[PDB]
Assembly symmetry: D2
Homo-oligomer: 251 residues x 4
């Protein structure tokens, strides 16, 4: 009945919001999980809120830190065995149009939202290919990887990059019989610290012209689609886009 | 227990993909009515999954508009109010657009398009505003996303199902109907549809078609339908769920 | 330079709106054109509003009438020579949700919007293949073949069918070296009698939350993308979706 | 038609000295535009410009699209030659034949500096310089079929072209909502016979397979030039935020 029995997952940015719920439901379904974040304070309380060191641990790591990724995999391996699942969830937002984006804002967002996903995906492939683990890489895009937003230009670029880079990775792993799948998840608006800290964002995005359901989602909405994609239930799904958005992109 | 309390109709549930959707729906607590055109096959399919306390066969052609109300009525009497409709019944025709006879055109669309419309329309009418966490799952295909030179009418039917389903999803969402509508897009799946087409599995296992080098199995489509039928997916509507071994990613 | 020199086009529903502008710009660029429509009064006016019978003629033909398609082609070939271009433009709308759509309404719309495009595409391929014509079939879909509309359920079905069926036809023609291309055009809202007759449609579609440009298009907006698709300029374009919609589907 | 379709337009075409960009510049001049082409190598660029016309209609400017400060000089130079810029074709791009697994971090950053940062610099500057001027301005960003589907041996390239695809929609929406009179669209060529393809041994043969390109051959630069003329002209005044795919059927299957 444990849908993730034997799986061991790295969830970047798993200390708040969507990443927190992903790790929560991963542990509930039998996986061992390492959550990462930049603030060690909020991190280990997040992990303790889910369970003990036998099922979940916290490793301080900036997803843009290339070298840290090797240590992150090493640490997770020593803790729970070989890594089977990578959720590249860490990401940041910038409320600027393309016109108004400074080059510093552009580079900073892309180093987390794109370079970090690249680092996790590249290393994930190298470290789990050809081990018969039913391995799965889950890259967090967004509906902003599918449609534009006039005030999120850099974010749009990063999530569109993640969308298609993930298909390249999925195809290579499939053609080479690596036993690694790569898919992208595309949440619509979700009630998280990111949305909560943007004044009026939930009210704006609950407009029926934005989200037809008339409300935004909860972090568990994204957690459950990630459980499906991490499990061997989805052993035929690779290179695909999984959209959980209240109908946002359907109009 | 992921479908606790759900009551599902699965059209074309006696073979292939539909049979596996029924199997896993029962396994997760749903009560299920499967349909098909042949009573022999249907009764054997239903008892192969469980007793009449959890699964039953109803003879119904999905293109039979009048039978759709009877089918809901029969399911409601057995199991209570329907919460879940899987419009899975469909047929194929191996013909290019150029070579498609109008008889073949009309016949395939009457099942693959008209039947999905009948089930979706009736499902909205019978499930809205009842707090059932209702979910309509419309079986499209990768052939609703990309073309196939020798499947012209099938392509037409599956593209229609893809976009019509978004219309329904939006209307239900904007009206607070408590009904979600999504489409599932399988790649090649080992089923009687594929088994009885000589050479098909060998053809579609080519890496230029399916990058995984093999075709899927009916349970690959059952598990995404379980997700879509369950309250776990309460924020998913109007979306396309593609399970295809990488077919459309290249 | 006539960008459609020597072309011979059938434009269904070419007496009003988008079809009328398509025929107008086709003859301006050197094509000979036959436009069809059901009302002979409007249709005769439209032809001579554009040119003489040496460049354009009107044929009364219902696009849903399968037998008339053979005589429409026959009549066009006898008038101007072998057809090189079919734009399947005739179409109707029904303002009903899926839930509210009667089977009568469903069947009427699809008979024109889908069956008619099928009849013209199937016969277009048969009559134009293997003739060195640089043949081009332009099937009029819509943004409603890309996104849903809660109050145009049958219309959504018809335009999604046109979108993907055309890909099948394009692939078959290209793999068999037929020298026929097949593409779909997806207008956003366009000021036409179809839109004018629906009360409030222009105002609804001009909202920025619908069309970001804040206004709807004009028939010439679709005529010019069709000239591109009918001309040999587009000899490498097949199986593709050409979206002219004021940004409607980009958000 | 009887009129120059780009009469009065002033276009910057990055990477306009070879291949697709060279053909865009050539057909732009044919349709009445004044054009500045860029590239990193002045030997190629000066010959490319003269191969199309005199300095009254086309000029070369040496500029690496990844060089942000040079973008300002490039617009200044173009304005001084021809007046206000109306059309920006972000075409400069490079390829790297590596899977995601096999991509070195320096390969990643180098390709994205050109294919992504350069398109961002040109789009941002283009909006700033062309907005609110009544020019019928148009920004054409060169994506690829590889911004629509994956390629197992072009991981960084895929990332860059997916980014260009969606970043362009953001810009199109902002320009439209603000009445800037600037449209932004992406072009998605399939395989095209260019020096880029010519220098990758076996690439044309591979992409000519029917399982890749259903027409059984790859395109030619003029195929992309003509859709760019359409997008640059006022003919396309209602087209923004959209993807224009000219690929021989590659993505239709
Ligand atoms: N919420 C939405 O509406 C929504 C919609 C679509 C997509 N998404 C995507 O979903 C993902 C999660 O978003 P969220 O809304 O849950 O964000 P959130 O509530 O702000 O949480 C982000 C998490 O990522 C961590 N993080 C941020 N930068 C990091 C870095 N450089 N290295 C490592 N960890 C980092 C944060 O921890 P520290 O602050 O301690 O680093 C935090 O745990 C993001 O990729 C976002 O783009 C969100
Ligand atoms: N297999 C694939 O590779 C694949 C891929 C993508 C999508 N799909 C789609 O998935 C669905 C299931 O396909 P499958 O491969 O499982 O097909 P299958 O093995 O041929 O099974 C078809 C099922 O539908 C029933 N059926 C056929 N016509 C019907 C009608 N008019 N009314 C009611 N029931 C009918 C059949 O029972 P009776 O014959 O007794 O009626 C049978 O139970 C179809 O919509 C198909 O288009 C399949
Ligand atoms: N206008 C828009 O906003 C818009 C947007 C996206 C797509 N479209 C599509 O563009 C196409 C043209 O639309 P429009 O707005 O130009 O329409 P319109 O103004 O209503 O004109 C439609 C034309 O088609 C003819 N027609 C209608 N039914 C026909 C039939 N069964 N057989 C032959 N001809 C027929 C009409 O003449 P008779 O009445 O005399 O037959 C008329 O000439 C349609 O496919 C529509 O779905 C329109
Ligand atoms: N060929 C295809 O099949 C194909 C398909 C889809 C998309 N594309 C895209 O189309 C665009 C043009 O490709 P192509 O095949 O024509 O390439 P190409 O034959 O290699 O020509 C590239 C042009 O860009 C210039 N260039 C390269 N790097 C540059 C930089 N950093 N700054 C400024 N200019 C630079 C080159 O000149 P210098 O080297 O002298 O700078 C040359 O003028 C690229 O974005 C490519 O990704 C091509
Ligand atoms: Mg939208
Ligand atoms: Mg493909």
């Amino acid at each position: 009945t444990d849908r993730l029995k034997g799986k061991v997952a790295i969830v970047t940015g798993g200390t708040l919001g969507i990443g927190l719920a992903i790790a929560d439901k991963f542990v509930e379904e039998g996986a061992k999980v390492v959550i990462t974040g930049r603030h060690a304070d909020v991190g280990e309380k997040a992990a303790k809120s889910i369970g003990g060191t036998d099922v979940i641990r916290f490793v301080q790591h900036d997803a843009s830190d290339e070298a840290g990724w090797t240590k992150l995999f090493d640490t997770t391996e020593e803790a729970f065995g070989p890594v089977t699942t990578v959720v590249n969830n860490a990401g940041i937002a910038v409320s600027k149009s393309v016109e108004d984006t400074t080059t510093e804002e552009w580079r900073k967002l892309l180093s987390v939202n794109l370079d970090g996903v690249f680092f996790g995906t590249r290393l994930g492939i190298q470290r789990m290919k050809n081990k018969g683990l039913g391995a799965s890489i889950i890259n967090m895009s967004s509906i902003e990887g599918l449609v534009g937003d006039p005030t999120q230009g850099a974010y749009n670029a990063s999530k569109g990059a993640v969308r298609i880079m993930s298909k390249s990775a999925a195809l290579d792993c499939a053609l080479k019989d690596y036993d690694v799948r790569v898919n992208t998840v595309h949440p619509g608006p979700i009630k998280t610290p990111l949305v909560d800290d943007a004044e009026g964002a939930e009210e704006f995005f609950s407009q029926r012209t934005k989200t037809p359901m008339g409300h935004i989602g909860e972090p568990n909405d994204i957690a459950w689609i990630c459980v499906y994609l991490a499990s061997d239930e989805s052993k035929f799904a690779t290179g695909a886009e999984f959209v959980v958005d209240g109908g946002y992109t359907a109009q």
